[PDB]
Design an enzyme around this catalytic site. Structure first.
Site, PDB file in Angstrom:
ATOM      1  N   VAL A 283       0.961  -1.330  -0.279  1.00  0.00           N
ATOM      2  CA  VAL A 283       0.031   0.132  -0.030  1.00  0.00           C
ATOM      3  C   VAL A 283       0.931   1.257  -0.076  1.00  0.00           C
ATOM      4  CG1 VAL A 283      -2.272  -1.102   0.818  1.00  0.00           C
ATOM      5  CG2 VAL A 283       0.092  -0.905   2.329  1.00  0.00           C
ATOM      6  N   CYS A 284       1.616   1.106  -0.319  1.00  0.00           N
ATOM      7  CA  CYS A 284       2.946   2.443  -0.818  1.00  0.00           C
ATOM      8  C   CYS A 284       2.472   3.311  -2.011  1.00  0.00           C
ATOM      9  CB  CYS A 284       4.626   2.353  -0.492  1.00  0.00           C
ATOM     10  SG  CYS A 284       5.368   0.675  -0.079  1.00  0.00           S
ATOM     11  N   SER A 285       2.735   2.954  -2.515  1.00  0.00           N
ATOM     12  CA  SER A 285       1.825   3.235  -4.468  1.00  0.00           C
ATOM     13  C   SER A 285       0.504   3.564  -3.892  1.00  0.00           C
ATOM     14  CB  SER A 285       3.011   2.974  -5.150  1.00  0.00           C
ATOM     15  OG  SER A 285       2.161   1.519  -5.666  1.00  0.00           O
TER      16      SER A 285
END
Lengths: 163, 162
Positions: free
Chosen positions: B49-51
């Protein structure tokens, strides 16, 4: 560690692949080379130098000639996590033609002594640029560039002429 | 000797770029010295769920940050600078946020912000964190309990702490 040359790659390592899909399964090297004719080439890594420029394309473009010679699978391996290898594989529309695998451990290349230090280039310890034709785990042909930035002997054209 | 509210200034250095030959690297001083810096780190390019939920918020509030006097907003990750860039381009986050790499992991190792993510098929990476640093001193630090959570290192939080 044991200089690859014309031996049995079969060493208990394993490589990766995917695109951030939760299960985290990995592929044992046996499932990859056992009872198969494999053409495999490795490179410094996703998004680097002349990899996604002169090295990969030739293999995609000759995917047919390979299968014509009976090659079971053509794979690209690199010391990159499987998610970056995939992002990159998608970017250069090389998937579906070539099976991309990762080796985040570097364990695969370490067992074949195919790691080189590319810290000067800002990439950690990576693999050299190589290609090889492996039959049922045995290396029938091996090509290791003298300099990771050269694509003189690990290209698709060469290995193809060796099968 | 984990980070907490001290002087980040440790002789390490981080990266950036897009396969441009010279291979220069930025000393941490040039980044934090005499500046108000908002910095957040994450497991790595093209992951969980970083980008998706972490980066965007920072881009979207880039103005509010500068309104508070923040000199620079940076994203750091244990990835080579070429992958960080490919990724930064992909999520159109550049030009808004300065992306740096830490291939050594040395930057995070000096702050004890590395965690083993081999189960997820990523090597030793950094934890998900964010911090507000003034002239090298950590005025605010946020470290997620689990690298996959974005509960305390989000832009919204750090913003309310400046």
């Amino acid at each position: 560690i044991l200089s690859a040359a014309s031996n049995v790659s079969l060493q208990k390592a394993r490589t990766w692949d995917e695109g951030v899909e939760s299960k985290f399964s990995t592929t044992p090297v046996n499932d990859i080379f056992k009872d198969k004719k494999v053409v495999i080439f490795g490179l410094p890594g996703a998004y680097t130098g002349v990899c996604s420029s002169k090295h990969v394309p030739p293999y995609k473009h000759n995917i047919d000639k390979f299968k014509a010679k009976g090659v079971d699978s053509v794979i690209c391996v690199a010391i990159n996590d499987p998610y970056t290898v995939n992002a990159w594989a998608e970017k250069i529309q090389a998937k579906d033609a070539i099976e991309f695998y990762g080796d985040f451990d570097g364990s695969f290349h370490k067992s074949l002594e195919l790691t080189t230090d590319l810290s000067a280039g800002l990439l950690g310890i990576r693999s050299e640029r190589w290609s090889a034709y492996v039959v049922d785990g045995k290396v029938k042909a091996l090509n290791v560039e003298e300099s990771p930035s050269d694509v003189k002997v690990s290209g698709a054209e060469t290995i193809l002429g060796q099968i």
